Amino acid sequence: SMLDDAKARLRKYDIGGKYSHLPYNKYSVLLPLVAKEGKLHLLFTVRSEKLRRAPGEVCFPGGKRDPTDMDDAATALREAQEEVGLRPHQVEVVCCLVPCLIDTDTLITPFVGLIDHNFQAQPNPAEVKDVFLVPLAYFLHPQVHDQINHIFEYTNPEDGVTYQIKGMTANLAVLVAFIILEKKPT
Ligand SMILES: NC(=S)c1ccc(-c2ccccn2)s1
């Protein structure tokens, strides 16, 4: 099936816990995959305008590890619950993708999660101003804008609202799209 196929593909790129013990400042992100109308989508947030770090920007749910977290996946799930109400019974963590190094002292670990078909986002307004879905296939033929620097623009056909997706968030989306959709019969 579509979902079994996605997981089998994703597992071949799982790096494991290899890098997770290194002595960095540590953050995790969840890349939430949602099936809708016969196709896979990614779920994104727009961060609240009142946050210190990157207010108003499009990003995946995530944040800083704390001492309660058993491992890096736990950080990602704790943060996804706090930001959009996603509960643990509603997500299957499938793998851990290549982590991102930044500012010489920080390591960000992305986890791909399959989301339950009855989940509905309850955005917490102190952290998240908006929640939206993008079809995974958009990332193979995006609408690119040059700020010189590559920015994606996505317009939701439901309401005509345009979103800008960039940086690490945009890089990870393209990666997940390549992994799951490359080389497929129609
Ligand atoms: N969710 C996003 S984009 C961020 C979360 C945390 C961020 C940060 C923290 C310390 C220094 C610089 N940026 S950015």
Ligand SMILES: NC(=S)c1ccc(-c2ccccn2)s1
């Ligand atoms: N939830 C997301 S996307 C992030 C959380 C942590 C991020 C970060 C931290 C330090 C410097 C730069 N970016 S990004």
